[PDB]
């Protein structure tokens, strides 16, 4: 099963009980964005991140009464149609708001049962993706495909280190390709134990295909209330990219000297084949539109891995 | 019966009839569609060899001036990028794309690929979260039918085409329309089946390697290359990989007779085989700009993946 989260007086996590931390329900988010939850029917704002006032420019109480209808007039009917009752928690809808306080915000919404989860992040506003797609497809074998993928991602993102991280049948991991800035340790060829990514992290990564720690030293921002009014239970946040990272994994990233981290699942035959794993030495908020490019690349790599593995077997 | 290609018309080959379809050399027509321009150049020196006859009007230069310069001089910023992206021996399927600001012609999209020692350069005029939203909707579709319907509707919304269909090949190469989105008033093709020879075996082979093809105006005359043969080889210039390549006059007669002014299909490739086509129709001529066509190319790949996934959920 899972332990209760901390804020419901559950045990603190160790290397004895890695597998039992409820990472999906941390009750908090990373501070480079803001999150609101809301009722599926009424559009009634039920929870907000204590930092919402910053991003939205709204007097705190104003929000926690109001309706999405009021708050987002153009958007609220689109949401209603895009995310019908009963849809999967994996389905997401995005829009760009030109919002008074903040030039442009990206809005990302998904639905978990009766709750809409809304994420707001700063945003903005060429051929590198098309060029990359053809490059991946003409790679002659899996090894070269891995090399092209890591190089392409590094060029698109500027990340200090991009790895392709492949799982063995026992969930042992192996770095099979790597693109990195001069003057970093090489992780190429190295293998790491299964517990470095515990079973409950792997399952959640099979369904929700991208996560990131934008700053490995930033404090999480609580949800208020912490419990969903609807259920008097924790809000599931695993489909939210803003979700606070496990402190265990923040300790791991800090001990390696990483300041910003991101990864993309490569899913083949319904299973987690591996990860595009990215490191930056310093804090780094990759903007939403560039993340989208990596999300596309994730799908394309999933296709090409199967194609390429089929021409060996 | 499968038989080798006839020589093209310009090398004294025969004219093509319903009797001998499968032997038309559709990859070497010696000509392009008039809404863009094409140059060929030597892959090592960058000497310009062939050009479409309309090139002066896209590129704003006399032929003899174009042909008298190397790509190093014509494309000083792109020439080194081309050479890195398209190394000798690379496959003909690999494409490099850039946007140019050309004085006379505005923003041009440049698409380049390499066939042996030849570079092929295509120039076309070029111009929010719809793709991301579509990607997730496709993935959440519960079964093959719902996927097919979401895919057709999405493509129609992105493009404004009068008709978008998902055409699926059977094992005997007969095809069937299994989903479609269509303009009000058009008659339905859903569930209809069409003989295998409607898309002969040499088109289907090409359609497995080069995944998008089109006919922007089914009445437009093709524009010859000049000279027609590659001076490197005194042989035909391979245009399989060029979206500007002229369409088989057999196929254009088949489209005009249907009332279609514009056509475009995207290949859906599963396990190395052509599974089906995203086929689109417009009643009037219609040019879809290169950046919009890129969205369809990306959806072609997504759909190939999702078709595998939906079919595996099915035994
Ligand atoms: C008690 C359990 C421990 C534990 C937990 C844990 N680990 C993750 C997530 C990740 N671990 C990763 C491992 C590596 N990254 C690398 O760069 C290398 C090698 C150089 C390894 C072995 C990765 C890639 C992830 C994914 C997330 C990311 O990209 O940063 C989690 C889940 C984090 C979250 O989503 O909140 C957890 C709980 N780690 C341990 O070392 C043990 C002691
Ligand atoms: C003598 C041979 C004939 C022939 C040749 C032919 N056909 C193609 C390509 C295509 N044919 C297609 C057929 C259909 N389009 C539809 O909408 C339907 C059903 C409602 C069918 C059956 C399609 C979709 C294509 C693909 C290209 C496109 O999407 O427009 C070629 C190759 C064309 C080229 O690439 O230059 C050839 C030679 N068609 C016949 O009917 C016989 C008489």
Curated annotation (Swiss-Prot), chain B:
The keyword Kinase applies. Residues 143-307 form the GAF domain. Keywords: ATP-binding, Chromophore, Kinase, Nucleotide-binding, Phosphoprotein, Photoreceptor protein, Receptor, Sensory transduction, Transferase. One of its GO terms (biological process) is osmosensory signaling via phosphorelay pathway. It comes from the Bacteria. Changing residue 280 to A: Binds PCB (in vitro), but has aberrant spectral properties. A tetrapyrrole binds at residue 21. Contains one covalently linked tetrapyrrole chromophore. Lacks the cysteine conserved in plant phytochromes (at the position of Met-250) that binds chromophore. An engineered sequence used for X-ray crystallography forms a thioether link to biliverdin through Cys-21. The natural sequence can bind phycocyanobilin and phytochromobilin in vitro, but the identity of the natural chromophore is unknown. GO terms for molecular function: ATP binding; identical protein binding; phosphorelay response regulator activity; phosphorelay sensor kinase activity; photoreceptor activity; protein kinase activator activity. The keyword Chaperone does not apply. Residues 23-91 form the PAS domain. Photoreceptor which exists in two forms that are reversibly interconvertible by light: the R form that absorbs maximally in the red region of the spectrum and the FR form that absorbs maximally in the far-red region. Also has a slight blue shift for the far-red maximum. Could also absorb green light. May participate in regulating pigment synthesis like the carotenoid deinoxanthin which could protect the bacterium from intense visible light. In the N-terminal section; belongs to the phytochrome family. This is Bacteriophytochrome. The gene is bphP. The chain holds residues 4 to 321 of 755 of the full protein.
């Amino acid at each position: 099963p899972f332990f209760p989260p901390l804020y419901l007086g559950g045990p603190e996590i160790t290397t004895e009980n890695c597998e039992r931390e409820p990472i999906h329900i941390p009750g908090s988010i990373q501070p480079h964005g803001a999150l609101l939850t809301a009722d599926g029917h009424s559009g009634e704002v039920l929870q907000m991140s204590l930092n919402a006032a910053t991003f939205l420019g709204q007097e705190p109480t104003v929000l926690r009464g109001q309706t999405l209808a009021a708050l987002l007039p153009e958007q609220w009917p689109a949401l209603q149609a895009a995310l019908p009752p009963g849809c999967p928690d994996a389905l997401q809808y995005r829009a760009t708001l030109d919002w008074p306080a903040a030039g442009h915000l990206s809005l990302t919404v998904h639905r978990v049962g009766e709750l809409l989860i809304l994420e707001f992040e700063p945003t903005e506003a060429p051929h590198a993706l098309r060029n990359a797609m053809f490059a991946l497809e003409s790679a002659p074998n899996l090894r070269a495909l891995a090399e092209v993928a890591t190089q392409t991602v590094r060029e698109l993102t500027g990340f200090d280190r991009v790895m392709l991280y492949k799982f063995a049948p026992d969930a042992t991991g192996e770095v099979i390709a790597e693109a990195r800035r001069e003057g970093l340790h090489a992780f190429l060829g190295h293998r790491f134990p299964a517990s470095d990514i515990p079973a409950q992290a792997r399952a959640l990564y099979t369904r929700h295909l991208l996560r990131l720690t934008a700053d490995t030293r930033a404090a999480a921002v609580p949800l208020d209330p912490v419990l969903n009014p609807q259920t008097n239970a924790p809000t599931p946040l695993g489909g939210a990219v803003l979700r606070a990272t496990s402190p265990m994994h923040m300790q791991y990233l800090r001990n390696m000297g990483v300041g910003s981290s991101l990864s993309v699942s490569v899913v083949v035959g319904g299973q987690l084949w591996g990860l595009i794993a990215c490191h930056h030495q310093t804090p780094y908020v990759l903007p939403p539109d560039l993340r989208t490019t990596l999300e596309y690349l994730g799908r394309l790599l999933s296709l090409q891995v199967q194609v390429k593995e089929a021409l060996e077997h």
